[PDB]
């Protein structure tokens, strides 16, 4: 790891974890991409994150994660080609397929059909109230991708706070947070997952992942003159040099880690409180503990992914 990207606290205090299903995961996702014609003839990131997930849940999550990267690529291609109509039509179909995936399983657009299959499968694990929350969150993600389309085709660099708000949606913070719950086998009650310690631990895990991605791409994403990156917002609106922007993003990433360590303690104290001597409480306690454990695993999975992925 180059010194500008190295984070000793991750290396020393966040040991990597790997889900035992990882070998089958890689090839089964590749087979799904081929069968769905989503790439002409990433799973490790999920296998280091959703520890404890049932094999079938981890497979559905990995296929969705692979689909997501194929969507990011189509979005980028529509942007650089100025295909505003094609993007608008896709945007509309993803909104519709999210609410009615079965209707879109054999759509002419293979990206839409692949999306529908992955969502249909994710909808099969937990009650319909979880499905509705996933859908609510992902409708918001789609519209954030539309805002990025608008910004990038017009060459607009969002302000720092504007970007930070937008990135919580284009990175899909709340989708990865939602997916903790099928991974530990339990839809959490609103009073549990909205506990301030759970909420803050969940946020910091995703801010680390998004901002570290921005750090691992700032120099390349200048050069070619991009606009969506915390470092680019800092250079453009705060007159930072590239070196100054790298240091500022790095400090913000480092603070996510030590803020997370403090709130993790509170979240695990909350998990202890949930185990109140009843079976239901022990089950909720264990689900919270598992989910917070995987919020922690996201730090190390993301960190080492950026130094392994091409
Ligand atoms: N966690 C590592 C995968 C995150 C990929 C993030 C992106 O898709 P990438 O930097 O790969 O293009 P985004 O469009 O949000 O910048
Ligand atoms: Mg991208
Ligand atoms: Mg993107
Ligand atoms: Mg990025």
Question: In the numeric block, which tokens belong to residue 74?
Answer: 């189509």
Burial class (CB in 10 A: 0-12, 13-18, 19+), 20: exposed
Obtained via which technique? Answer: X-ray
| One-character DSSP codes across the chain | --TTT--HHHHHHS-----TTHHHHHHHHHHHHHHTT-S---HHHHHTTSTT--HHHHHHHHHHHHHHHHHHHHHHHHHHTT-HHHHHHHHHHHHHHHH-GGGGTT-SSHHHHHHHHHHHHHTTSS-HHHHHHHHHHHHHHHHHHHHHHHHHHHTPPPPHHHHHHHHHHHTTHHHHHHHHHHHHT-PPPHHHHTSHHHHHHHHHHHHHHHHHHHHTTHHHHTTTT---SHHHHHHHHH---HHHHHHHHHHHHHHHHHHHHHHHHHHHHHHHHH-SSSHHHHHHHHHHHHHHHHHHHHHHHHHHHHTT--
Instruction: For tokens 């403090």, name the residue.
Output: 262
Q: Is the dihedral of CA 280, 286, 289, 293 positive or negative?
A: negative
CA atoms of 282 and 247, how far apart (whole Å): 44
Which ligand sits nearest to residue 215's alpha carbon? 4
Q: What are the C-alpha distances in Å from 130 to residues 8, 64, 86, 134? A: 37, 17, 31, 6
Instruction: For tokens 């389309």, name the residue.
Output: 149
Give the residue among 306, 305, 303, 308 at the shortest CA–CA distance from 14: 303
| Burial letters 245-282, b for 16+ CB under 10 A, else e | bbebbbebbbebbebbeebbebbbebbeebeeeeeeee
Query: Quick one: residue 167, left, alpha or beta (phi over 0 = left, psi -120 to 50 = alpha)?
Result: alpha
Cβ 274 vs Cβ 288: under 8 Å = yes
Structural resolution in Å: 1.6
CA atoms of 145 and 139, how far apart (whole Å): 10
Phi and psi, residue 63, nearest 5° = -65, -45
CA atoms of 105 and 108, how far apart (whole Å): 9
Residues 6 or more apart whose Cβ sits within 8 Å of residue 54: 183, 185
Q: Is the CB of 218 under 6 A from ligand 1?
A: no
Instruction: Calculate helix-pair angle for 22-35, 55-80, nearest 10 degrees.
Output: 50
Question: Which of 171, 179, 298 best tests ligand 1's pocket when mutated (most atoms within 8 Å of CB)?
Answer: 171
214 alpha carbon – ligand 4 mean position (Å): 5
Cβ 292 vs Cβ 202: under 8 Å = no
250 alpha carbon – ligand 3 mean position (Å): 20
| Burial letters 177-193, b for 16+ CB under 10 A, else e | bbbbbbbbbbbbeeebb
Question: In the numeric block, which tokens belong to residue 83?
Answer: 């295909």
Q: Is the dihedral of CA 222, 42, 103, 136 positive or negative?
A: negative
Question: Which of 72, 217, 303 best tests ligand 1's pocket when mutated (most atoms within 8 Å of CB)?
Answer: 72
Cβ 45 vs Cβ 53: under 8 Å = no
Distance of CA 144 to the CA centre of its chain: 14
Q: Is the CB of 302 under 6 A from ligand 1?
A: yes
- Which ligand 1 atom lies nearest to the CA of residue 228? 16
Within 10 angstroms of residue 227's Cβ, the number of other Cβ atoms is 17
CA atoms of 51 and 20, how far apart (whole Å): 9
CA atoms of 177 and 23, how far apart (whole Å): 24
Cβ 169 vs Cβ 136: under 8 Å = no
């Amino acid at each position: 790891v180059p010194p500008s990207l190295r984070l000793p606290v991750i290396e020393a205090a966040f040991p990597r974890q790997l889900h035992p299903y990882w070998p089958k995961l890689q090839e089964t996702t590749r087979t799904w991409l081929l069968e769905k014609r989503l790439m002409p003839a990433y799973t490790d990131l999920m296998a280091g994150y959703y520890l404890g997930a049932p094999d079938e849940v981890l497979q559905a999550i990995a296929d969705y994660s692979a689909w997501f990267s194929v969507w990011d690529d189509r979005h980028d291609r529509d942007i650089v080609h100025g295909r505003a109509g094609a993007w608008r039509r896709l945007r509309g179909l993803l909104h519709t397929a999210l609410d009615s995936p079965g209707d879109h399983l054999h759509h002419e657009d293979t990206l839409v059909a692949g999306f529908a299959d992955s969502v249909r499968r994710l909808y099969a694990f937990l009650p319909a109230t979880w499905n509705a929350r996933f859908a609510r969150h992902f409708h918001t993600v789609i519209e954030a991708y539309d805002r990025e389309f608008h910004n990038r085709t017009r060459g607009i660099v969002p302000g720092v706070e504007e970007y930070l708000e937008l990135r919580r949606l284009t990175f899909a913070h709340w989708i990865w947070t939602d997916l903790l719950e099928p991974s530990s086998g339990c839809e959490l009650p609103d009073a549990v997952r909205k506990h301030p310690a759970y909420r803050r631990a969940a946020l910091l895990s995703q801010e680390f992942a998004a901002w570290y991605n921005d750090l691992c791409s700032l120099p390349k994403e200048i050069a070619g003159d991009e606009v969506h990156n915390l470092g680019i917002s800092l250079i453009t609106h705060h007159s930072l040099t590239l070196e100054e922007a790298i240091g500022e993003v790095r400090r913000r990433v480092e603070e996510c880690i030590t803020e997370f360590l403090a709130v993790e303690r509170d979240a695990l104290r909350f998990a202890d409180e949930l185990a109140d001597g009843t079976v239901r409480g022990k089950e909720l306690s264990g689900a919270v503990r598992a989910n917070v454990g995987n919020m922690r695993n996201w730090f190390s999975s993301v960190y080492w992914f950026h130094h392994e992925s091409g």
